UniProtKB/TrEMBL annotation, chain A:
Signal peptide: none annotated. Coiled coil: none annotated. This is Deoxyribonuclease YcfH. It comes from the Bacteria. It is an enzyme of class 3 (hydrolase). GO terms for molecular function: DNA nuclease activity; exonuclease activity; metal ion binding. A divalent metal cation 2 binds at H128, H153. A divalent metal cation 1 binds at H6, H8, E92, D204. One of its GO terms (cellular component) is cytosol. Its EC number is 3.1.21.-. The keyword Transmembrane helix does not apply.
């Protein structure tokens, strides 16, 4: 039994066939999934899915790419939604230097505001980092994010950054489809290097479908290919990776 | 007057409006462009473009993504084509760890074979690196690529890597649209750090259209936006970056 700790079932890409996508994941041993909302539309859709399906939990927050759209009203709105017993984490939050819609200074202020929110709610945080690794680490360290705990979601950095993440911040590291890519050296090295007690699995569906479905619409059932690859890389049974990644998710979340 | 040192005018995206695109670049002061062929199809199209247009030059070689497709017959075909007076460089070659079509070990062998080929042709090499920076620098040092010179094309690594590229390999560094991106600081840091006498501009059209056309089909005319951005970052005139990038191109290649 696995948990897909990070999935966008709230995406328009599932509008035709969500029920079948969820059934395929359940039938593959994916018993629980954490639906991630990161702006007004995706939060609304997320809150409707966690009401409709018993085994779906919500992570809500504000995406760095959309940081310029984050208002005082949105921050009070997320704080009141988080009182829902199945809203278990705050995110995906962080920094993204690939897209230019939001400048870095606005991204950093929205990031700090959501750390402060997560501390008030006593919920863990889910971190999106794209091309902003050292700026994210400095923020997590400055804002004492070790108080709330969290995930560096779909982490690709050096093992030296992984060690700051697990040993200084006491965060978890989630791995997704990229651990399955042939020439993806960094994620395979992260999976080998990081303790099994710090690892979580995710799809980020519909994005980043693993081998052998790269370029195709991802779905939560494919989290089994991530878990298989972690088993292969660490010399562990699939059963051991399912059991430990579940233990880890249950420990971090409520 | 500027040179677009790296463009894919051979791309299907120009099938219906190539003439208009070339005319728009020429009117914006982009007098010469270097068309890049990197597999059977793109080489054949590039070879045709340089015979049709007086001011287009060719750079031919084999792309790391398609390294598994490279044969002994392709290596001999490229060696022959390179005799063309307007074939001035071999590339784009290198390493790409984004895509999985070709495994690193086969990409490394094909990269080494084209360094050896460029040494025989006495022609400079154009380097494609994606997510493989240290593996590329190691190959270039180990194979004494300083003997042919070349371009780190669309470079975005650290200043330490730039100093190895310029001060040890004696390569040039080209910048494209990403120098116009606000949040990706590394290209701007490279533009500020690297000597004006080591810099070239490119579009890589139709990819990586600069601001304010991010998302849109790129074209060689947009190399002026890259030139403008460099001038601002190095506190130089546009005329200065145009003249220096042209002298650099004219010195590395034999046009
Ligand atoms: Ni993300
Ligand atoms: Ni996500
Ligand atoms: Ni390239
Ligand atoms: Ni190119």
């Amino acid at each position: 039994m696995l948990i897909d700790t990070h999935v966008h079932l709230n995406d328009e890409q599932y509008d035709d066939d969500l029920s079948e996508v969820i059934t395929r994941a359940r039938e593959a041993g994916v018993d629980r999934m954490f639906v991630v909302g990161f702006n007004k539309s995706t939060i609304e859709r997320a809150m409707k899915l966690i009401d409709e399906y018993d085994f779906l939990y919500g992570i809500i927050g504000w995406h760095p790419v959309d940081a310029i759209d984050f208002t005082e009203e949105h921050l009070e709105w997320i704080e009141s939604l988080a009182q829902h017993p199945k809203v278990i984490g705050i995110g995906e939050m962080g920094l993204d230097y690939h897209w230019d819609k939001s400048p870095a200074d606005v991204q950093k202020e929205v990031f700090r505001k959501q750390i402060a929110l997560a501390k008030r709610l006593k919920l863990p945080i889910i971190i999106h980092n794209r091309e902003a690794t050292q700026d994210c680490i400095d923020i997590l360290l400055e804002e004492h994010a070790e108080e709330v705990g969290g995930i560096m979601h779909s982490f690709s950095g050096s093992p030296e950054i992984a060690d700051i993440v697990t040993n200084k911040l006491n965060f978890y590291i989630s791995l997704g489809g990229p651990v399955t890519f042939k020439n993806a050296k960094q994620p395979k090295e992260v999976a080998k290097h990081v303790s099994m007690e710090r690892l979580l699995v995710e799809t980020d569906a519909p994005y980043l479908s693993p081998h052998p479905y790269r370029g195709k619409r991802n779905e939560p059932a494919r989290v089994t290919l991530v878990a298989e690859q972690i088993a292969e890389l660490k010399g562990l049974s699939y059963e051991e990776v399912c059991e430990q990644t579940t233990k880890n998710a249950e420990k971090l979340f409520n």
